[PDB]
Each structure stands twice: as C-alpha cells, then as structure tokens.
A paper describes a structure:
F0F1 consists of a hydrophilic F1 domain responsible for ATP hydrolysis or synthesis and a hydrophobic F0 domain housing proton translocation across the membranes. ATP hydrolysis/synthesis in F1 is coupled to proton flow in F0 through the rotation of a common shaft. F0F1 from the thermophilic bacteria Geobacillus stearothermophilus is one of the best characterized ATP synthases because of its structural stability and simple subunit structure (α3β3γ1ε1δ1a1b2c10). The γε rotor in the F1 domain (α3β3γ1δ1ε1) is surrounded by a cylinder composed of three noncatalytic α and three catalytic β subunits arranged alternately.
To obtain [name]-active F0F1, we constructed a mutant F0F1 with a C-terminal-truncated ε subunit (ΔεCT-F0F1). The prepared ΔεCT-F0F1 was subjected to dialysis in phosphate-buffered saline to deplete the bound nucleotide, as described in the Materials and Methods section. For ND-ΔεCT-F0F1, the structures of two rotational states without nucleotides were obtained at the following resolutions: state 1 at 3.6 Å and state 2 at 3.4 Å, with the γ subunit positions differing by 120° in each state. Further, we obtained the F1 parts of states 1 and 2 at resolutions of 3.4 Å and 3.3 Å, respectively, using focused refinement of the F1 domain. The structure of ND-ΔεCT-F0F1 significantly differs from the structure of ND-wt-F0F1 in which three catalytic β subunits adopt “open in βE,” “closed in βTP,” and “open in βDP”. There was no nucleotide bound to the three open β subunits of ND-ΔεCT-F0F1, but a density corresponding to phosphate was observed in the βDP. All three β subunits in ND-ΔεCT-F0F1 adopted an open form, implying that the first ATP can bind to any of the β subunits.
Author numbering:
A (entry chain F): 1 to 470
B (entry chain G): 229 to 284
C (entry chain B): 24 to 501
D (entry chain E): 1 to 352
E (entry chain C): 252 to 377
Write the structure that this text describes.
C-alpha cells in the first residue's frame, strides 16, 4: 500500500516506518495531510524529502516546513517521485516557493501542467560544448575587461546600494532583447524586504514579463533554503533543453545554501568536518553547480552573489565555491559616488577568458593597454596629492588625461535608467567598444571635454555630446 | 648654516617620536590579533579533541 | 499503566527526559507535578526530550508529567500594557494577575513577500545625532552595536520615552540584565510616564538558559498582535549576544556538534527567524508596522566577531557607538563611517532632509581634519573655518540624559547651525545658546513650530532668519 | 529510604544507587561515615553533593574531599537538604571550610545552632530597592573619583605588595565603625600561607572581631573550591536579611571560582564551551552574583579581586565577570613606590 | 614493458577531501582538521609508484606531476606540507606574477629540484 507512519520527530528531521518491500527511494517526496480529531490537535499539511535508509524499514526524511504539532503515529503517504515543479511559459512573470506553489496573488496553476523532478543527473560528457563561446552582454566594461562565458559561473561581489539590482535588471533586459533568452531569479536565504523591493522594481520596470522568481528567504527552514536553488535550476533547465535558447540564472546568495546544508547534516547525525560543516560539502556543491553548463542546444550562465562568514576567505564554504567560478566582477562605492554607473571596478574585475586565444589578439592588446594605463593613473594618484600637479612629466600629464577620458568612457547609459533620466540607453557591441577604446588610446579624442564621455554608447555619441557641449 | 643644523636636529626629534608612536599603535593591534588567534586555536583544538573522543 | 501521561527518567542541567506521553505533539507545553512548565523538543522512539522552563531543583526522577494540549503560547492583550512579565507571560512585579483572553504561538510564520510594503513613516527617536544622520523608519530593523558600558540602555530608554504622544506601543525585552538594573529602568520609565503605553519583558542572568532563549520570541509575539490589529509597535532586544550565548549553552548541553567559536550552526537561523518578523504591512493586510532595535555587545569593538557579523548581515543598517569618547560624558559618538541606514532617508521629513546633507558634509570634513591638521599655525585657509564649524557641530550634537528633543526644535537648531548663525558665538556657550533658543522659540516662534508640525516642511527662510537674529540680539555672550 | 550504596567510583566523581522512589533532589548533601571493620579497610568521613539523575535509580555526585579508601557497597545517608552552614553571631571571628565546620582551634559550634541552605533562589523583583544609593566608605579617593554603590560589585586590581590587604582591612574597619555592618571574607582558591598571613594580620589589627572568614584551599577538590563562594555569600545573607544591616563581602579571586566550575564540568563530561570553559559559565556567574543585591531592608556590596588570564580582557571569564561590575579600583606600583597611600590610581579607576 | 610514461594528477587536494568525506561517512575517528590518520599514507602509496626501473627490470620509467592548490598561497597548510614531504622537489606559481602577464608565473627562489644536474643535457647544465 506504500503507506507509513511517523515513529520519530526531532527538529526538522522526521523518521517514518514503512511496510516491508515498499520503501520509497532516495529524494522521494512524502505527504502528510492530517485533520485534528479534537481540541488537543492541530491540522498539518507538510511535505518531506527522503534522505537515508536507516534499516529496519525506517526512512529518515527532512521537512520542507515547520514540524510543530507532529504526533508519533501519524499517517504518511508517498508521491512515488521527487519534488515536482511546474515548467514552461506559465512560470514567466510569477513568484514560486520551494514546493512550486505560486506565492503571488495571481492564482494557482492547473493540475495538467507539466511538472519535472528537482533531482537530475548532470549532463554527460558527450553533450557538452566543445569550445568556449563568449557571451556578448552589451555592457562596455564587462564585455571588455571581464567577459562572460556561456555556461560559465560568474561571482558577483559588492555590498548593498552600489548598483547590484540595477546591473541585474540591465543584464536581464539586454539578454531578453538581443538573445531572446529569459532569466530566472532564485532568492536563496536573503531579506524578504529586499526580495519585495526587487520584485516591485522589476514589475515597474517591465522586465518581469520575461522572468521567473523563486524565493527561499531567511525565515524558511533549512530544507527550503537548500532546495530553492535546485527548483530555480530545474526551471531554467527546461528552457535550455526544449526551446534551445540561452538562459540567465541568478542566485541571491550561494553561501546560504551551504549553510543550510551544514545545519541539516548535524540533524541527520553525520560526523562533522573541519569547521563543523557537512562531510558532503564538495560533492553537494558540485552536484548543484555541474548542471549549469553549455550544450549543443543552448546554455545556462549564472551570476552568483557570494558571502563570507566573519570575513574569512579561507573558510571551507567560500573555498569550495570559488573553485567553480570563471569570472569576478567587483562593485566599488567610490566609483558609485563618483557617478559613473556601470558601478563595476575595472581593475578588480577578472575573467578566465581574458586571453588572446579566446577574445582575439587585438582585443587582448586593447584590454592590456587600458589596464596598464589605469594602473599607472592609480599609482600616480599618490604624487598627484603629495607633490600636487607640479613636478609631473609630459608623459604623466598625458596619461592622466587619457586615463580620465577612459574612466569617463567606461560608464554607460542603461535601458533601466530611462525611467529616471529620460535618455533611452544603448547596446554597445564588443567590436564597437573595442574600436572606441582603440581610438581613445590612439589619442584621436584628446581635444574633447572629458565630460562628453559620461553615459554614452558608441564612440559617435561622444562626438555628438561634445558638439552639444560646444 | 647653524640655524639649518638646529632645524634638522628638531626635525629628526619629531620624526623619531612619530615613528615610536606609530610602532606602539601597531603593537596594540598586533596584540589584539594575537589574542584572537590564540582563542581560535584553543577552541579548534578542543573541539577536535572532544569530537575524536566522542566518535567512539 | 496508561501511557498518555509521562514519567521522568533523567534530569540534569535543566534538561529532562520522560517516558510515556504517546499523544504529545512536538513543541507542546508539558507541566511537571511541581507546577513548572516545560517544552518538548525531541520525540524519540521510546521517550520524549523535555526542556525545563524554570527551576529544576524540585524535579526528581519518577515525577509525573502532564500534557497541556497547547503549542508554545503566551498571553496577549491590552491588559498587558504597563506590566512586567517573564517570557511565559506570568507577572513578576506583583499587582495581581493579568486578565488577558488571547494567546499567540511562539513560533509563527513571518509576513510573506506580497504582504510587505516599503516603509515611509519616520520614527522620531528624539536624539539629535540619530534623527539627523541615521534616520529610522517604522518598519526598519536597525541594529545598535557597541562595546560594554556605552549607554545603549540609555539610548533605548530615551527612544522609548520620546514616543509619549506618537500613539506607538513600545516593548522592552531585557536579556541577561541585572535585576537591579531592570528595576531602575522600570522606575525611570514610570517616573517619566512611559508605562501607559509600554510592556516590559524580563529574563535576568540568574534565570535558566531556556527562558533567556525564549524571551525575544515572547516579546515579538506580544508585538505581533498589536501589529496585525493595525497599530504600530516598537520592540527592543537588550542583548542578542546574551541570547545566542544561552542558545549555545543549551545546544552544548544537548550534545550537538559546535561550529565556529563553539556556536552551533543554527545560530544564524535563530537570529533570522526572530528579526524577519519586523516588517511594514501593506494596506491590504492592514497597514500595521513593527520595528526592532536589537543590541549587540562587542569586545574591543571587534566587528569581525561571529555574532556581530551575523546580526549585521540580517538588519537593514547599524548604529555604532564608540567607547573612546564615552569617558568625556558625551553620549558616545556615532561613528560616521560605520553607521548607515540604507532603508532610511525616505523616512526623514522634508525639514530635516533639506539640512541633513550639509550637516553630514560638515561633520565629515571636520572628522577628516584629524589631529595632524590641528598642528602648527599655518592653517590659514578655509580649513580654519572648517575646524570651527566642526567644533560647533560636535558641540551641538551633545545631549543630556532623558531629554528627548522635538523634531521641530531639532530642525530649527540644525538650520541655525548650518546657516552660519553660530559661526561667531564661542564653543563654550553653545549649549546655553541652544537651551535659551528653545525657550525663545517656545515663547515667540509658535507659528513656526505649528507650521513645521503641520506641513512637515520648513517655514520661509527670510522669516526664520529674522527670528534667529532677534534671538541673537536678545542673547548675551559670557 | 534513607540508605544508599556506592556503585561506581571514578576519581573525584562518585555514583550512588538508592532504592526506587526515594532519590534525593539535586544539590543535596550525602554523608558517608564508615568505620574500619577489619585491617583491610580505612575509616572514611566524606561529604558528597548531588549533581545529576542518571536514571536507573542512580545518582551522580561530586566529592568534597579525597575519595581514597572508598568501597563499592558502602552505605550512604541522605540529609534531605543542601549543605547547611551555621549563621549568626557565632560565625564572627571564626574560620570555616566549605562544609561549615570551624577550622581554627577555637572549638566546634554547638549542633543546635541555626544553619541555612547554600543554594537559594535570588531575591525576587519586588524585594529589590528602587533607587541607587552611594555607600560612603570614608576614603577620599574612593568617595570622590570612584564611588561605591550600595549593593554594587567592585573590581579590585593589583598584584601583591601594593596595599590590597591594607585597603581591605581599612574598608572593613571604616564600615564597621561608621555603619555598624560586618564584613565577610571568602578566600576562593587562596594560597595557604598567604591566607594564614592575612588571618594573622587581621588578628593583630583587631579587625577580626567583626568579620567571618571562609577558606577554600588549592588542595581541596573542585567541588569545595566552587562552593566556598556560595557558603560565604549565604553567611552574609543572614546579616542582610535578619539583622537588616549593610554588609561587605570580599572574594579573594573569582577567576579561580570560574576555573573550578570548568574543572567540575569537565569531570561531569559536558561538551566544552568557547575556549574550554563550561557551557554553563554565564548562568553559574549569574546565580552567584545575582544574590549580591540591595533589598528594602538591607544590602550586600562586594569587593572582588580579578585576575586576567594572559592579560586578555576579551577572554571569556573576564568578559563574563565584567558584565556585572559597577565600579573599578586599580592599585599602582608607581604610587606605591612614591610616598602615597592607599596607592589607588586616580585615572585608571572608574565608576558607573 | 620498457616504455616511458608521464602521469599528471590534476588535483590531489580534491582527492584528499573526497577521502576525508568517505572516511567520515564510514564513521572512522577523525584526526587533525577532521582528516583521517592515514591521509599521509594515502598519498605516499600513490606517489611512491613513480620510479626509474633498473636495467634488469627493463629500464622503464614513470614520472609524475601531482598538483596541489593552496589557499591565498598558504604553503604551510596540512596537505601542502604532506605532499611536499613526499615529492622530490616543488614548483611554485605566484598569483601576483600571473596577473602581470608573466606566464608561467614561476617563482625561482621557492622552486627547487632535488635531481638537478643529472636531469639536464651538458649544454643546458653548463
């Protein structure tokens, strides 16, 4: 009959006993629907996920919600399959929880809608792409200094209020516009206030019509805080594998996933690790990350925000996470206050693809020259104050001038910023931005005012802005 | 020249005093970091010992 | 041998283990024969793990444990206002029992994503420095972090007192405080008259660790009822660091594997589950609001510590108190670099908003003009004016104990400072100038005060300047 | 019944098994008095303190003395109450161990004298005084720069040879002379020779006529080293409550109290806390300090000497102790070498 | 068979972490940093198989180039020390030198070769 009963309840871990020969497999979903029989009981509607086979026909499971009110001997039924989440175009412009139920007020989803399992083996070695394909994001700084790669993991760094949400929205809009690809946002263990603010921002910017949202904010139990990333990933996998289109995936904080895993392993009873983490840290993180790859029929690329506990970068969780990243983009409050609004640090941004083999020798030379000039300006910044503008050579003055021009040109006007600035914004191809930076480095625009480079697209915009200036 | 010699001696006075003050200010922060590291080492060692004793 | 009523097996260090209780539910309340409550955590195969919420000296092996049929609950009602209760809701001050009629679960879900709404209503703390530089919204979670003996309790008491006529319910939760200190705090609150709208929840150091662990949840549960009824609530947690220490003690007693600094890995969940309940409800849900002001006690100002980092990761912004300048008697300096209110800014009224920017710029210039710029006599540039104005700002930001200042007077004095009207009056007379200016305002600028209080905006500059000049003519320098 | 039998001896930890239904409560005192039945046994006079109920009608206890000579099956008698210590006028001028038995050669206390339990709940919210009062000590430095709050805890800093004993004696003398209240001294973890020297100094100075002394030596087991502070406090509580007079309470070193607590926790086997201390450190310190308060009809104020391990003020034991202090007085060797007494630092000293 | 073989282990730290996970799941008692006691033996077994066979065995050979990944250049960590104590020499790569475009970012001072001289032709040696 595949019907079991509860024998042990302890925290978020529940043990179930089954009839012999009908044990549910690992990662199966169990349902507990109960109606109170008197005034000394409470109604329970709970979902569990199988974790271990403890022997003696007993199965140890983790809870997807609070376990308050559970009573030993309660009836448990099994769904015969792992957690299933609706997929397809019905998920666009919608907010989902870990179970896939819609959180927003826009109604529920019909029962006939296709649902797919949470857990899936990683794509095989044969199906993967054979060579690196750079992803043209349309943003000057990113496409020049720290290019993004299809199927690659990008680590996003920076505090709050430095343009993280604006950059996320701009990336989503640009990808949906120029590649026809949707994005998926997974709010793994962060502030509900921030989640609501981002939802409203995307709603009134109009980007939400091409994205799906799953929220696993801090107040949720460890089971949800683990499986939210997986349900977002399995939402994106459908679009990768069926529509054959590129997809963006955003993870609000990957550190909360490993923290929830560490929290739940102790309840499971496994022996601890170096800093009390779960013994299965590396394999769990790898099982999560290995599904975000590129195949012959599209790709999924992910932007992941990272947190460090106690500012310890040698901690096992960041150490394990960092081995999967391919590029890093850093956001600087000093640049944000100066007012250039790609808000991204040009010197701290690194990428595995910044090599002449992948992006081309001319692109590599341009990037190296720009980096060297900016580094020279940063070094000069000391004598600029200590000795003043005096005692500088002609080369120093010229390089300061060129570096000021380059720094002002790195800024861009976004489609998102239109609603607050009036100007529409533009999409800059990689070849166009390489040509513009080549022209600036050659000195063809040493006569134009440096303020004509603010918030412009291609190189012609600078010329027109200079003409408007004078 | 005599005034310049007096001035350089006073400048060396001030420079050495500033160097000593900076050294002491570095010492206090280094001691704080040392204490934190000592506590972390003790707690990690004791946790590992008790875990190993409890594994049996 | 009916086994729906338990029997104790093991007792030690405040944790029990009982046989029986077949029908007990996880998280239920169990009462011992002694009359002491207890909460059941683990439902093992044969026995039940019970945490004792009281003195375990009277509990012996073989005692009887009875079910109550209720998940962890606290009494909530209007009658709870002005009383002093333990986390279980029992009165501690005497004055007879509390006649409530409703209860709420300790563990309750937080408001959802669609339920919340961005905050826009100011919370007037009545402190010049906070209200000018680091505003507080009515749904904001703002952390107050500092070392020991930096006047955090004084700040909390002033903030609570300032809510006299703002129709806001206040809750003070004291974790690990000395009973004498809590009694003196209650005495000063009664003396200032805040007991008409405040609730005090106490859990001293001598109490067992489970009560210390439960106190903040009881406080927020009491707040939630008023919040959902549509009112506005303010709740203050005295030491989440002490609460976390108590939870660590309990976890170590329950033989769980510890993590960094011997804390269990569940400490972040412990704090997030509590601080996620403070939110600004939307008009659809009712428009209520509950704001929290947690306190964290650091050692040697070590922000790198585990609990301070965890709490900072959760709250919207933090206010930093420095023990360097506490010795001078000044209310401890708000570290400008380390204090930020990301949610704030939208909360500030128009009057303070039009002047906070320039006040912040002047303070930043003065602070960056360190002691190195105060040496010698060659500083003949505008740096001398910067130093003079910075000294003026620092002197003005000083405040007496338990003397909240109305926002109108705060705006007027800050505008007077920023418009150069105090550039000539010496530093030592600034406080007397401010006090006499408040008296002069209350005597003559009643129209200005009413205009600000009504329209939440400044009056005419050409009129306010004449008012200031008239007061200056009336004033005499020592 | 009243009789139990030893079933397990493991160092200073003894486990006793009673008959079902008559287990003693926690913190009770168990007495073992045995006489050598033949030449293969030795006489035993030992006192135990109940700590845990292990189930199966067994009880886990900690010993207050040496456990050598114990035999499995020896009879154990229960007292039905925690350790009881004589209180009143008879305690003045005497020296007591942790168990309340006199140590000096003055003569034993009659068995009919009133005795009080060691462990006791702290005074409730109602009983506490509502306003802060200042205890006038009569010393200019203390009364001016670092005032003493009635019912407050004062941290005393300074090594040997700087005037700690002289300051303690003068505080006792001034309080007794100008307030009529006695003082109590509790030498937790003292060096025996230093304790003897201090006793002789007080006897010579005549202070001892109005004080009570409790000593816990370093050669005593951790249970005694941990309960000496409590027995001193419960000696002072009688004069706080019944006589209704202000009392001083001196603790020789509270860090040794915390260390003894950590040692006994390690013996019991609880998982270690942050830096190896007991998990119950904060609650133990609270249960000790919270009884030193001011009530409606009296007050107890305490002067406690604090040792800082490795000069780390962020160490858990000093951090926990400092959260209860109301004032601090520091002794200075520079002021000692100068011609100034009591050599109290006027700048390092602070007071709430 | 008399051939010559070159083997490159792309990361031994990952293998050590996997072994630690396996041992912890097997409920073996942990040692330093939760590592099992035989963590040194695990690498000694693998690396000691690389040898230059004598003339009687056939003259075959098998050279190995194990990889170890440090954390912020912490060469004093447990696994790096254990591996260094086993292999002949080591080649250290510097992140700072890698960033400046110096590929490879060989650190000549730290890098040593215990079979130096005999492994070079006469011209290169001189």
């Amino acid at each position: 009959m595949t019907r079991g009963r509860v024998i042990q309840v302890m925290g978020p871990v529940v043990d179930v006993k089954f009839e012999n020969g009908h044990l549910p497999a690992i990662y199966n979903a169990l349902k507990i629907q109960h109606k109170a029989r008197n005034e000394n009981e409470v109604d329970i509607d709970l979902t569990l996920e199988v974790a271990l086979h403890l022997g003696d026909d007993t199965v140890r499971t983790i809870a997807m919600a609070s376990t308050d009110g559970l009573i030993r001997g309660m009836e448990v039924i099994d769904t015969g399959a792992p957690i299933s989440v609706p997929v397809g175009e019905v998920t666009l412009g919608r907010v989902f929880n870990v179970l896939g139920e819609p959180i927003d007020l826009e109604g529920d989803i019909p029962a006939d809608a296709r649902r797919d399992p949470i857990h899936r083996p990683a794509p095989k070695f044969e199906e993967l792409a054979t060579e690196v394909e750079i992803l043209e994001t349309g943003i000057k700084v990113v496409d020049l200094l720290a290019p993004y790669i299809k199927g690659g993991k990008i680590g996003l760094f920076g505090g709050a209020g430095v343009g993280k949400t604006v950059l996320i929205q701009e990336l989503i809009h640009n990808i949906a516009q120029e590649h026809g690809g949707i994005s998926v946002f997974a709010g793994v263990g962060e502030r509900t206030r921030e989640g609501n603010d981002l939802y409203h921002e995307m709603k009134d910017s109009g980007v939400i019509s091409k994205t799906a949202m799953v929220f696993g904010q801090m107040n949720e139990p460890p089971g949800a805080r683990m499986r939210v990333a997986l349900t977002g990933l399995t939402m994106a996998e459908y679009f990768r594998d069926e529509q054959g289109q590129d997809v963006l995936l955003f993870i609000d904080n990957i550190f909360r996933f490993t923290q929830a895993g560490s929290e739940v392993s102790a309840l499971l009873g496994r022996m601890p690790s170096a800093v009390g983490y779960q013994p299965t840290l590396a394999t769990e993180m790898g099982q999560l990350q290995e599904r975000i790859t590129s195949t012959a029929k599209g790709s999924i690329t992910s932007i992941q925000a990272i947190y460090v506990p106690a500012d310890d970068y040698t901690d096992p969780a960041p150490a394990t996470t960092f081995s999967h990243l391919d590029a890093t983009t850093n956001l600087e409050r000093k640049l944000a206050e100066m007012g250039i609004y790609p808000a991204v640090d040009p010197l701290a941004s690194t990428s595995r693809a910044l090599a002449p083999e992948i992006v081309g020798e001319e692109h590599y030379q341009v990037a190296r020259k720009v980096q060297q000039t900016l580094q020279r300006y940063k070094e000069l910044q000391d004598i600029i104050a200590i000795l003043g503008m005096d005692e500088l050579s002609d080369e120093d003055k010229l390089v300061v001038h060129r570096a000021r021009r380059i720094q002002f040109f790195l800024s861009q006007n976004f489609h998102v910023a239109e609603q607050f600035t009036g100007q529409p914004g533009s999409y800059v191809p990689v070849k166009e931005t390489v040509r513009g930076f080549k022209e600036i480095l050659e000195g063809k625009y040493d006569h134009l005012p440096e303020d004509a480079f603010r918030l412009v697209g291609r190189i012609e915009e600078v010329v027109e802005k200079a003409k408007a200036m004078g | 020249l005599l005034d310049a010699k007096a001035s350089e001696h006073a400048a060396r006075m001030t420079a050495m005093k500033n160097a000593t003050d900076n050294a002491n200010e570095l010492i206090r922060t280094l001691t704080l970091s040392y204490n934190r590291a000592r506590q972390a080492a003790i707690t990690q060692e004791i946790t590992e010992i008790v875990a190993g004793a409890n594994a049996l | 041998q009916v086994s729906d009523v338990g029997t104790v097996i093991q007792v030690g260090d405040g944790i029990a283990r009982a046989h029986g209780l077949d029908n007990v539910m996880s998280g239920e309340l169990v009462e011992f024969a002694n009359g002491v409550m207890g909460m059941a955590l683990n439902l093992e195969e044969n026995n039940v793990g019970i945490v004792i919420l009281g003195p375990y000296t009277g509990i012996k092996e073989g005692d009887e444990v009875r079910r109550t049929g209720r998940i962890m609950e606290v009494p909530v009602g209007e009658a709870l206002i002005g009383r002093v209760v333990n986390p279980l809701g029992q009165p501690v001050d005497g004055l007879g029992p509390v006649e409530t009629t409703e209860t709420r679960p300790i563990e309750s879900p937080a408001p959802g994503v669609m339920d919340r709404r961005s905050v826009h209503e100011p919370l007037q703390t009545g402190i010049k420095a906070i209200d000018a530089l680091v505003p507080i919204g009515r749904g904001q979670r703002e952390l107050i972090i500092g070392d020991r003996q930096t006047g955090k309790t004084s700040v909390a008491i002033d903030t609570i007192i300032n809510q006299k006529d703002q129709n806001m319910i206040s809750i003070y939760v004291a974790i690990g405080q000395k009973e004498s200190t809590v009694r003196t705090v209650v005495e000063t609150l009664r003396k200032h008259g805040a007991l008409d709208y405040t609730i005090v929840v106490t859990a001293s150091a001598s109490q067992p660790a489970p009560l210390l662990f439960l106190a903040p949840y009881a406080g927020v549960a009491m707040g939630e009822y008023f919040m959902y009824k549509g009112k506005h609530v303010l709740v203050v947690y005295d030491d989440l660091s002490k609460q976390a220490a108590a939870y660590r003690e309990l976890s170590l007693l329950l033989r769980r594997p510890p993590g960094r600094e011997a804390y269990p890995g569940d400490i972040f969940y412990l704090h997030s589950r509590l601080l996620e309940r403070a939110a600004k409800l939307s008009d659809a849900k009712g428009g209520g609001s509950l704001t929290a002001l947690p306190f964290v006690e650091t050692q040697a100002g070590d922000i790198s510590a585990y609990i301070p980092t965890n709490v900072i990761s959760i709250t919207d912004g933090q206010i930093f108190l420095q023990s360097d300048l506490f010795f001078s008697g000044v209310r401890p300096a708000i570290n400008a670099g380390l204090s930020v209110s990301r949610v704030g800014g939208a909360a500030q009224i128009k009057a303070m908003k039009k002047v906070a920017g320039t006040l912040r710029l002047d303070l930043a210039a003065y602070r960056e003009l360190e002691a190195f710029a105060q040496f010698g006599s060659d500083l003949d540039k505008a740096t001398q004016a910067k130093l003079a104005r910075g000294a003026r700002t620092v002197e003005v930001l000083k405040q007496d104990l338990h003397q909240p200042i109305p926002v109108e007077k705060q705006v007027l004095i800050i505008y007077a400072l920023t418009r150069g009207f105090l550039d000539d009056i010496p530093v030592e007379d600034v406080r007397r100038f401010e006090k006499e200016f408040y008296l002069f305002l209350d005597q003559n600028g009643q129209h200005l005060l009413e205009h600000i209080r009504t329209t939440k905006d400044l009056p005419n500059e050409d009129d306010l300047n004449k008012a200031i000049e008239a007061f200056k003519k009336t004033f005499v320098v020592s």
